[PDB]
Amino acid sequence: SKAVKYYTLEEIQKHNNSKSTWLILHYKVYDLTKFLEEHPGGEEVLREQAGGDATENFEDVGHSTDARELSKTFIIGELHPDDRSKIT
Numbered sequence: 896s897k898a899v900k901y902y903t904l905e906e907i908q909k910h911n912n913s914k915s916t917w918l919i920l921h922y923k924v925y926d927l928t929k930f931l932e933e934h935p936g937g938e939e940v941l942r943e944q945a946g947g948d949a950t951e952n953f954e955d956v957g958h959s960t961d962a963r964e965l966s967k968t969f970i971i972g973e974l975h976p977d978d979r980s981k982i983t
């Protein structure tokens with residue numbers, strides 16, 4: 896169970912609500928569904944970014960090393976290589 900899992904942006908855009916909230920950070924895909932109520936910055940800022948890239952939003956508000964480590968709980972795979980050029 897160690898092989899990479901790729902998701903297309905097309906698929907990621909469908910996961911946009913509290914039953915299944917995904918987003919992308921630095922080409923990695925996270926399922927934050929069980930994190931929404933735990934996030935110190937609140938649920939809304941996460942819901943607003945669901946189904947897309949939130950890398951600049953994440954980096955712009957100075958997330959700590961502790962935040963970066965914690966994000967590993969929610970990683971489900973990587974952005975498909977063919978979609979990485981869409982993330983600007």
Ligand code: HEM
Nearest residue numbers: 925935936940941944949952953956957958959962965966
């Ligand atoms: C999987 C990713 C995320 C995790 C694990 C996470 C975790 C955390 C943690 C632990 C904090 C407390 C402060 C810190 O340790 O830096 C925090 C604060 C915050 N986060 Fe996140 N965060 C994530 C994604 C995001 C995203 C995508 C946004 C923006 C859309 C966001 C917006 C904020 C804001 C605004 C605060 C509050 C800052 C403050 O008032 O001091 N976070 N986050």
